[PDB]
C-alpha cells in the first residue's frame, strides 16, 4: 500500500479509475483567506506544495509529471519530472515554471500534476567493468 | 500484449529490436493531404494525431516522450510527457510545442515520439494515515 | 545486475541510499584543467558526455531526467528525457538546454541528471487489430 499523509484533508489526490496510471496532485496554498489563488508570471517559477507526503513501498518510486491540462497553460515542472524516492517523507512539491507568454493564475486545490508509482532496479546492484558485452545496436 | 489499432497502415509505429524500451509514434495528417508538411512557429504548438490507438495491459501504462532527435529541433510535448492509461481507447495525440527560435516543419508519418509501456502501482491501493513511518 | 563502464573513474554516478530510485550522472568534460567549467547561455544547449556506458538487463531500460536542482537553474534535457535501451552500449549523453534568462556554468564531474532503471513491456509482444475493445 501507498501510505498517504495529508496536510489538510482537501489535499487528497484525485483518484481516477481502477485503470488509472496516476493520481492527481493538487496545489496547496494553505488555509488562510489569502491562500485562494497564486500567480505565475511568464518566465517565472513558483514552488507549490501539494500537502501530500507518501510512504512509497521499497522497490518503487514516484514519478511526478504535469497533467495534460498543464500543457494548455504552458506550465512545466522546472526540473521536468519529479522523482520521489521511497525513503522520502516530506510533502511533494511541484516547482512550476511558466514557459508561455501569459500569466497563469492557479486556484487552491487545483489539480496540476500526476503522481505515478513505478518499480525501479536497485541502484546498488551494479558492477564496474572494463568492457560491456557487445550488441548489434552497440554505439 | 499491446493491441495496436491503426487509422491508416502507414501509422504503424516503428518497432525496433527485442530490447528497445519503446516504439516510435508518427505524425498523422491524413492519407494524402496537400499539406503533408506542417510548420510550428517558435512559441506555438500543434496537436498531432498519431493515428495509433492502443490497448495497454492492466497494470501498465504508456509514457510518451520526444525522440532524442526532437531535442536539436527544440520541440517538446506541451504537457512534457503523455500518460496513456490502460483504459484509454482513442488515438494517442502529441501536442508538440516549439520552445526554440526557428520554425520547425513536421512531415506526415514522420517518427516524433517514443511510446514506452511501463508498470504502475494500483492507485486504489492506498491508505490515508496520520503519520508516516521512518525508514529502515 | 547493471554493468557500468566508466571513461574515467571520477565519472562514477553518485549512488544514494538503498531506497534511491536512481543514480546521479555527472558531467564529463575531459581530463583537462581546461575542462574545469562550461557555460550554457540562455537559449543555448550543450551536449554533455557522462562518461558512463551501461549494460542494462533485458526487460529493463534507463530513464534520464534532470536532478531536482536543475529546475532552479532552468536547465532541461533538450529532448525532455533520455531513454536508454538495454542494448545501447555507448556512453549516456545529456544535451542540456538553458531555458531560463540567466547564465549557467557547470563543473566537471558535477551531478546533473538522474538515471532510473525501470521495466518496459516487450515492444514485440503486440497484435495489430482491426478494431479495439472500448
Residue numbers in the entry:
A (entry chain C): 1 to 139
B (entry chain B): 1 to 136
C (entry chain A): 1 to 134
Q: What's in the article?
A:
Deoxyuridine triphosphate nucleotidohydrolases (dUTPases, or Duts) are produced by most living organisms as part of their pyrimidine biosynthesis networks. Their role is to eliminate excess dUTP, which can be mistakenly incorporated into DNA by DNA polymerases, since most of them cannot distinguish between dUTP and dTTP. In addition, dUTPases provide the dTTP precursor, dUMP. In this study, we demonstrate for the first time that the homotrimeric dUTPase of bacteriophage T5 performs an additional, non-enzymatic function in the virus’s life cycle.
We determined the crystal structure of bacteriophage T5 dUTPase with a resolution of 2.0 Å, and we discovered a distinct short loop consisting of six amino acid residues, representing a unique structural feature specific to the T5-like phages dUTPases. The comparative analysis of dUTPase sequences from bacteriophage T5 and the host organism E. coli revealed a low identity of only 34%. Despite the low identity, the overall tertiary and quaternary dUTPase structures of the phage and host were found to be very similar, with a root-mean-square deviation (RMSD) of 1.3 Å when aligning the Cα atoms of the monomers. Although there is limited sequence similarity between the T5 phage dUTPase (T5Dut) and the E. coli dUTPase, the comparison of their spatial structures revealed a high degree of similarity, except for the presence of a specific loop in the T5 and T5-like phages that is absent in the bacterial protein. The structure shows the typical trimeric dUTPase antiparallel β-pleated fold of the subunits. Three subunits are attached to each other in the same manner as observed in other trimeric dUTPases, forming three active sites per enzyme molecule in the region of monomer interaction. A comparison of the amino acid sequence and structure of the T5Dut phage with other characterized enzymes allowed us to identify two conserved amino acid residues (Ser68 and Asp85) within the active site that are directly involved in the enzymatic reaction in T5Dut. We have identified a structural element within T5Dut, a small-loop 30-GTNPAA-35 that is only six amino acids long, which is responsible for the implementation of a novel function.
